[PDB]
Amino acid sequence: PGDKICIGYHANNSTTQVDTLLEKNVTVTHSVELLENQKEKRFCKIMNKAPLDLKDCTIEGWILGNPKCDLLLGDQSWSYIVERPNAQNGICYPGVLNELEELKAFIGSGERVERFEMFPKSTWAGVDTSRGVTNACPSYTIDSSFYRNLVWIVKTDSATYPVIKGTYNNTGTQPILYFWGVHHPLDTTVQDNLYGSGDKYVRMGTESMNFAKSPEIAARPAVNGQRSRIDYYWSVLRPGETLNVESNGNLIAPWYAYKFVSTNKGAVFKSDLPIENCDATCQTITGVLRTNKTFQNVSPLWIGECPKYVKSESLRLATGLRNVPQIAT
Amino acid sequence: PGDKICIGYHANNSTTQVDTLLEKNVTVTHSVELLENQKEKRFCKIMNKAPLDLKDCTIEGWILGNPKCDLLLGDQSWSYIVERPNAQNGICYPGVLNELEELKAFIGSGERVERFEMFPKSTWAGVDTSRGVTNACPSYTIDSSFYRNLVWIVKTDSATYPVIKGTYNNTGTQPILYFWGVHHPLDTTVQDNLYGSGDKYVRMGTESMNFAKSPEIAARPAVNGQRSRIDYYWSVLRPGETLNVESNGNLIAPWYAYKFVSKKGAVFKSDLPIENCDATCQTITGVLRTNKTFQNVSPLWIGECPKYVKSESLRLATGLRNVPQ
Amino acid sequence: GDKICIGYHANNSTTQVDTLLEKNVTVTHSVELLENQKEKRFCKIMNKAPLDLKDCTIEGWILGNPKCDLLLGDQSWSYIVERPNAQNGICYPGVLNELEELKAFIGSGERVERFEMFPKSTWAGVDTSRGVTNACPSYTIDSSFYRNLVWIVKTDSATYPVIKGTYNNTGTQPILYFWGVHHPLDTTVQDNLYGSGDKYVRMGTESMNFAKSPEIAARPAVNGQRSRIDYYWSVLRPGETLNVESNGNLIAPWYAYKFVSKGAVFKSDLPIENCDATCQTITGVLRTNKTFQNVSPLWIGECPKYVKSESLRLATGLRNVPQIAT
Amino acid sequence: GIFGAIAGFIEGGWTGMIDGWYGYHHENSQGSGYAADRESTQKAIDGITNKVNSIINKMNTQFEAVDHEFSNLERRIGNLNKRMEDGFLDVWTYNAELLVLLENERTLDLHDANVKNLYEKVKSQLRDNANDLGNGCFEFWHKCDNECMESVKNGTYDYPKYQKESKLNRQG
Amino acid sequence: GIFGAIAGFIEGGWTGMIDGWYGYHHENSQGSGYAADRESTQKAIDGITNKVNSIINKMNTQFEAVDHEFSNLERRIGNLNKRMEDGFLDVWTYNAELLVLLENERTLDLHDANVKNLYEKVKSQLRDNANDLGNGCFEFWHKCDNECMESVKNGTYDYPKYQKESKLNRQGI
Amino acid sequence: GIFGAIAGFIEGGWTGMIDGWYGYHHENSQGSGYAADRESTQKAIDGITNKVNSIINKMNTQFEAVDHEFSNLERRIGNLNKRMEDGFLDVWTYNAELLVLLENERTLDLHDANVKNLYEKVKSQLRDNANDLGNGCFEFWHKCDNECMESVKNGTYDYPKYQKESKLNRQGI
Numbered sequence A: 001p002g003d004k005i006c007i008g009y010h011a012n013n014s015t016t017q018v019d020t021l022l023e024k025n026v027t028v029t030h031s032v033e034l035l036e037n038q039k040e041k042r043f044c045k046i047m048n049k050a051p052l053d054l055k056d057c058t059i060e061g062w063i064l065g066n067p068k069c070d071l072l073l074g075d076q077s078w079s080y081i082v083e084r085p086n087a088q089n090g091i092c093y094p095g096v097l098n099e100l101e102e103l104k105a106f107i108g109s110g111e112r113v114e115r116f117e118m119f120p121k122s123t124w125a126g127v128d129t130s131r132g133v134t135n136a137c138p139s140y141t142i143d144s145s146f147y148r149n150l151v152w153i154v155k156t157d158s159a160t161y162p163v164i165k166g167t168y169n170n171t172g173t174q175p176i177l178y179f180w181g182v183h184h185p186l187d188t189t190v191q192d193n194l195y196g197s198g199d200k201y202v203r204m205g206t207e208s209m210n211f212a213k214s215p216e217i218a219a220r221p222a223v224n225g226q227r228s229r230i231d232y233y234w235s236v237l238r239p240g241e242t243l244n245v246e247s248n249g250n251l252i253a254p255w256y257a258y259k260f261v262s263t264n265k266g267a268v269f270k271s272d273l274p275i276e277n278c279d280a281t282c283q284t285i286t287g288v289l290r291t292n293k294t295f296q297n298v299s300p301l302w303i304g305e306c307p308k309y310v311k312s313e314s315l316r317l318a319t320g321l322r323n324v325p326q327i328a329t
Numbered sequence B: 001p002g003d004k005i006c007i008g009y010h011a012n013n014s015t016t017q018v019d020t021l022l023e024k025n026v027t028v029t030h031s032v033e034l035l036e037n038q039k040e041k042r043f044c045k046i047m048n049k050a051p052l053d054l055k056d057c058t059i060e061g062w063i064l065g066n067p068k069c070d071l072l073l074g075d076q077s078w079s080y081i082v083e084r085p086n087a088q089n090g091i092c093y094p095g096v097l098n099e100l101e102e103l104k105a106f107i108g109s110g111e112r113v114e115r116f117e118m119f120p121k122s123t124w125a126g127v128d129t130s131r132g133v134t135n136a137c138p139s140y141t142i143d144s145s146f147y148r149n150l151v152w153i154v155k156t157d158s159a160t161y162p163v164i165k166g167t168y169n170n171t172g173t174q175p176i177l178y179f180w181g182v183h184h185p186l187d188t189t190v191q192d193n194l195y196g197s198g199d200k201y202v203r204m205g206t207e208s209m210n211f212a213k214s215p216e217i218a219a220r221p222a223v224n225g226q227r228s229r230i231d232y233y234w235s236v237l238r239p240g241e242t243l244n245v246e247s248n249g250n251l252i253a254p255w256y257a258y259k260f261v262s263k264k265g266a267v268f269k270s271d272l273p274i275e276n277c278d279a280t281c282q283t284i285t286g287v288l289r290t291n292k293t294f295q296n297v298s299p300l301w302i303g304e305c306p307k308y309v310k311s312e313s314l315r316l317a318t319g320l321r322n323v324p325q
Numbered sequence C: 001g002d003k004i005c006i007g008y009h010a011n012n013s014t015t016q017v018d019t020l021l022e023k024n025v026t027v028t029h030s031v032e033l034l035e036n037q038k039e040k041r042f043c044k045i046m047n048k049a050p051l052d053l054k055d056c057t058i059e060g061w062i063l064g065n066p067k068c069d070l071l072l073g074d075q076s077w078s079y080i081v082e083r084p085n086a087q088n089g090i091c092y093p094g095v096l097n098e099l100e101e102l103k104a105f106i107g108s109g110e111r112v113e114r115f116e117m118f119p120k121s122t123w124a125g126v127d128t129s130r131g132v133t134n135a136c137p138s139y140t141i142d143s144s145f146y147r148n149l150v151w152i153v154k155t156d157s158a159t160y161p162v163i164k165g166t167y168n169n170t171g172t173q174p175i176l177y178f179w180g181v182h183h184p185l186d187t188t189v190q191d192n193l194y195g196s197g198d199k200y201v202r203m204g205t206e207s208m209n210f211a212k213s214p215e216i217a218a219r220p221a222v223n224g225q226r227s228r229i230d231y232y233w234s235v236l237r238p239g240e241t242l243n244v245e246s247n248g249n250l251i252a253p254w255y256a257y258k259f260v261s262k263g264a265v266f267k268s269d270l271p272i273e274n275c276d277a278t279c280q281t282i283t284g285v286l287r288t289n290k291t292f293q294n295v296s297p298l299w300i301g302e303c304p305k306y307v308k309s310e311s312l313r314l315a316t317g318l319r320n321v322p323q324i325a326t
Numbered sequence D: 001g002i003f004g005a006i007a008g009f010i011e012g013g014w015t016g017m018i019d020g021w022y023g024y025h026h027e028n029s030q031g032s033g034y035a036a037d038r039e040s041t042q043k044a045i046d047g048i049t050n051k052v053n054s055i056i057n058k059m060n061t062q063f064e065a066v067d068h069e070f071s072n073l074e075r076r077i078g079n080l081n082k083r084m085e086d087g088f089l090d091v092w093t094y095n096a097e098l099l100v101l102l103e104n105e106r107t108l109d110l111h112d113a114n115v116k117n118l119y120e121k122v123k124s125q126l127r128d129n130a131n132d133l134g135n136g137c138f139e140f141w142h143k144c145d146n147e148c149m150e151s152v153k154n155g156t157y158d159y160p161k162y163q164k165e166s167k168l169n170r171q172g
Numbered sequence E, F: 001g002i003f004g005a006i007a008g009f010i011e012g013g014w015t016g017m018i019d020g021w022y023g024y025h026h027e028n029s030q031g032s033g034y035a036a037d038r039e040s041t042q043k044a045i046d047g048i049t050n051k052v053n054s055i056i057n058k059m060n061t062q063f064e065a066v067d068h069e070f071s072n073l074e075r076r077i078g079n080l081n082k083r084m085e086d087g088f089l090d091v092w093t094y095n096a097e098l099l100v101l102l103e104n105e106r107t108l109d110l111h112d113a114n115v116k117n118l119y120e121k122v123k124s125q126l127r128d129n130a131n132d133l134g135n136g137c138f139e140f141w142h143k144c145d146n147e148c149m150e151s152v153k154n155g156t157y158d159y160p161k162y163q164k165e166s167k168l169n170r171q172g173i
């Protein structure tokens, strides 16, 4: 009949929906999804630095120098660490690595290590070095071996274990991570055989640290065919500090140690996911995110720059309007 | 003169009020209160399961086997624990239960224990086992007794106290919670009397645990007539783990121990009664029976409870502003 | 014809707010809720001055370093100020055990009264006056010791006998006290100062047990010492009793503190001036009525909420669209 | 009120209208009464209901306070625990209380918008056949039957059918 | 503007109207001026003040951080304490920042809604007795008294009283 | 919808109008077609975009969870870590989810207001020169060619110019 002008709004083919406080499942013409739920199930280089693959070895296994862990021996630099859920090679001679959790925390933080001989075997006088071996700690080539960073010191043929002393002065600019031990025989028999007779001790100290232990002798349930135990210990020798070592007997001495470079967050992932020649900006413990989104489905645990973690399945914001296309029929 | 049609809105006898960002005390026709401020002042069953009432015994008294605390001595099943605040029967022979707070947290987890004899008295050779009783641990029936779960081992009438030894191997599927002690005499006289002469040690070991301790003789202030002390200890023997025990004196030995079965655990310290009621949500200050989504009663609870908030009221308007004529 | 028009207020304001929809929006009226300003000084809170440790650290103060004599005796504070560069701490090298826990206990206090717990005559048969060391000079003496401890040594003739002491806490206030164990570098120094043979330090209360013996060995020289002392602290509860027993190597408690329990300990360079505050942050006083602040999360008194925001300006007025005049 | 109808140009509500949130009052030779708009009332009930359930649903999680014990060498982590639990307590208290203040402001406005849109829906049917008084009411320029009133509410009101009669009386 | 009035179909504000947020500009043979609608200026002020006070009140708690030190064997609890404090700090910054953006958006809408509703209150009183110019202005078709100005404002404008003068003018034109 | 336009007195959208959120449909002897109103669409796009960016901005911190290990004398602090991290996870999930529900309700209201504002603008230009057909549609009481159509869309429609023609046609019907 007559000229029309009408006011109205865009519709479209979109079938994407959003919720509001008042209504669910509203189809809108335009929206943006703010939450990411896709990942690549792998470990990539962060800041172009490859992570450290422990492989069969555990963290204990790695830094004490389990003989089977020679693949890892010496210098390492990493953006993060990956320890496999079923690594076999850890502490092979049964005992406690004391303050272990606090050690795992320290290593995570945790950029690079340089291996080096801290106390040469000759440091200790009047004692036998060459007999510190066990069948509880084979290498892949000898049935009886021992940690590459410790010395199991035995009394010599004369049935006296002299007092031994060792000094190391840290003139470097880097903290040094180092390890030592105290042996606890199942027998007084084995005690007499391996070391002297009479009360034994292991004392150590620095400008800020003191340590004193004596052997606690007792028969214990067999582990790796050993009813005896070793107490392992760790510490960090700050720049400009000096270590003094002194033992009557039962010392498992430091031999090799680590110059330790701090970082600069750091992480330790327990996981069986593959490690590959790839780069990432965001690495979760269950995968790489490669995304623009603001929120992440995948994991609360990550190193690098990740979206914020939430339990949501979806976080889609309406940008367009309610979509009311015409029924075409 | 002309007919009229008018548009308008409901009103009603409501005097219920809500607050908004722009205005306080707005009477509204219909509203919903989201916060629950009422409780039943008692402890009820939770999942059709009663709680354990310690009554006169502290948690220490109960699991060490304080002579006054049997009658709690059987097995136990619980949905949560009630320790009465003034309970008087705990550590009877003075000393420290090491890692007490961490032991309270482990017991709090778990729903049930089965008491069993871990080491028969026959375990230790060459040594007396019938004489380890004190006047600091009376039962109700006798003046000198001791913890039912431990044996205070003492020298044989004919000296000396030899190396005693014992092992136990956990073949079950459940963890074992067990206790032991080291006696610390006030004198070398008491030390020589009960134990030999000589350096005394108490050593224990498993696949993953190492213990070693020696007596520390000195006189502490008198507590329950005792200037000596006992250091008590606890641990957990995992399924498949063997415990080795070796001492040549001053051992207060493990006698009975607990098969321990591990949700949300709760140890309530309260004085409220335990009635024969059932409940969905239990808080430390009483039962909440409610559909509301917030509660102002307590942050400590077991079961399914509303979120705790400091608010006095959380009333949402659903209807509209009430302005009746 | 006659006009009637509907409209809205405008003014000369150039103050802007932000909006979910729009960023730099000029409005007629508004309230800033955040405070970014601070007086860079410490003041009294609740009309109570703070305690300035000056050249001394918390350890030096409370163990009684001789160079810390100015702070000796009773003290009432609203908070504590430890200067970062302070050099008077533990003068005779060793570990103060559970140190962080001590620093937190002391921070939760407001007052201490210093008092002799164990008179030197408590320990019979031993020398209580030979002190004394060059690792702990006072300002006037080259060889002194902690004012709250006695380094006990054997009498001119041998030997060091069993020594014993008891203190009963009759009072209503907890007592904070200290002791130590000497760890010589040599068996020689051990033999010279104490007897021969196995030595111990043992102490107990109704609720606490302690036992330690000398760990003899040479450690790196620190203030001229290759020996060490292990320092310890504890708190004797009201009604509790302390027994002490040793045959050698005891650094004995001498003087202790009756202790009266927010609390804070500020490590800072800021001057302490004669003024009053309702709010004190570690970087300054807030004199304000604002709701939020961005100065510091660390404070004492009544402070606004700390947030990382630059500005939190709330629009109260409408959007400002004033008539353009040329 | 913010859309200006409730406690606005419709100065008061109706105790008499019982069956609905929003409604019509009519006067005529046959009588006078109240009647709820069934569709917009239900549409509001559905919305408000969904809002209340969304809020309840979002508020489902609880923070677990525990009351573990701490020894006298654990003042720091004991204090850490307490500050932690009081921190979460403070945040959820803020969230619930502010949400309620905000949501209540908005729910009142929804009701206001709904009343307003009913008025304009009627006004738009009626056109010049009726006179819009100040207060949400319309005085007809013709005789409005009970059929006629019911058609006004239905949305099926016949404007041309009454145009002539209305023009006249509007002229008279 | 969301309701369309402020910086909308009413293009600008009035520096001349200084005793209120919203109001009227009249011109008549007896003069002209700018006068505020008091009732709706006042209600907006009570409302907005309440909003600022409710926000201040709800924001009245503080999370408190601590000076506690940690040893070199307490790296895990020390880091626990840091992540917690950063956590409550981020949560509260967020709450404050977001709330301010959201409330500013809604405060400006409220002002817009109040102008819009004043404009409608007048448009419905006058009907065809006045002519809508643009920009929120009406030109009467009849002589309008100061008293007539007040009757439009106070809401008691008498439409029939001027319906004939107005209609004679309306289309004598 | 709340402003009553979208899916309200205007029943459906236009798949045909492809260059804008809000638009006109016209029909004249010259032709028929769809045209977006550019000014209001562009304003809405800027506003929606600022809002998305604000939300992204304010959400751009993260709580830090950690891989730290705990020993079996550390049940209490291990659980403290667990309850801490879950605690922040719950608070952030709550914020993102509640925010998206609220902003989604408001963003739809915004679109619904612009449509309504666009319709009120046109309605008030046309006055009685056009007849309301119902679904946001106006039928002119006069010939309206393309220039006159553009005129309405631009905000410069000349009601006097056509008021005689419209009145005469109105009487006829």
Ligand SMILES: CC(=O)N[C@@H]1[C@@H](O[C@@H]2O[C@H](CO)[C@H](O)[C@H](O[C@]3(C(=O)O)C[C@H](O)[C@@H](NC(C)=O)[C@H]([C@H](O)[C@H](O)CO)O3)[C@H]2O)[C@H](O)[C@@H](CO)O[C@H]1O
Binding pocket: A131, A132, A133, A134, A135, A136, A144, A152, A154, A185, A186, A190, A194, A224, A225, A226, A227, A228
């Ligand atoms: C052979 C056997 O089964 N008998 C056990 C007795 O011997 C222990 O048995 C194992 C086999 O599991 C080894 O033969 C142990 O010998 C070593 C070892 O561990 O390899 C031999 C080392 O050269 C020796 N090294 C040093 C530096 O001393 C080492 C250590 O001394 C011990 O590990 C410390 O205990 O032992 C052998 O000790 C065992 O004597 C008896 C008690 O358990 O039980 C027998 O079953």
Ligand SMILES: *[C@@H]1O[C@H](CO)[C@@H](O)[C@H](O)[C@H]1NC(C)=O
Binding pocket: A019, A024, A025
């Ligand atoms: C949304 O609606 C669809 C049907 O419209 C339904 O299957 C789904 O459960 C609803 N909830 C979601 C996933 O938003």
Ligand SMILES: *[C@@H]1O[C@H](CO)[C@@H](O)[C@H](O)[C@H]1NC(C)=O
Binding pocket: B013
């Ligand atoms: C209001 O209404 C409810 C139900 O109609 C009724 O129970 C109550 O008695 C009434 N209030 C008064 C005035 O008592």
Ligand SMILES: *[C@@H]1O[C@H](CO)[C@@H](O)[C@H](O)[C@H]1NC(C)=O
Binding pocket: A221, A222, B169, B170, B171, B240, B241, B242
């Ligand atoms: C523990 O029990 C198992 C099963 O009988 C046995 O193989 C093991 O040897 C026991 N522990 C030891 C080493 O005595």
Ligand SMILES: *[C@@H]1O[C@H](CO)[C@@H](O)[C@H](O)[C@H]1NC(C)=O
Binding pocket: A169, A170, A171, A242, C220, C221
């Ligand atoms: C350690 O080496 C540094 C550098 O020469 C020296 O000053 C210091 O005296 C040495 N310390 C010891 C204890 O030998």
Ligand SMILES: *[C@@H]1O[C@H](CO)[C@@H](O)[C@H](O)[C@H]1NC(C)=O
Binding pocket: D147, D148, D150, D151, D154, D156
């Ligand atoms: C709708 O209106 C007609 C009058 O036009 C009336 O007769 C009929 O009953 C009404 N239908 C309903 C269901 O409201």
Ligand SMILES: *[C@@H]1O[C@H](CO)[C@@H](O)[C@H](O)[C@H]1NC(C)=O
Binding pocket: E146, E147, E148, E150, E151, E154, E156
């Ligand atoms: C409202 O306006 C009329 C006309 O000027 C005036 O007579 C009357 O007094 C006014 N009422 C008031 C001030 O409320």
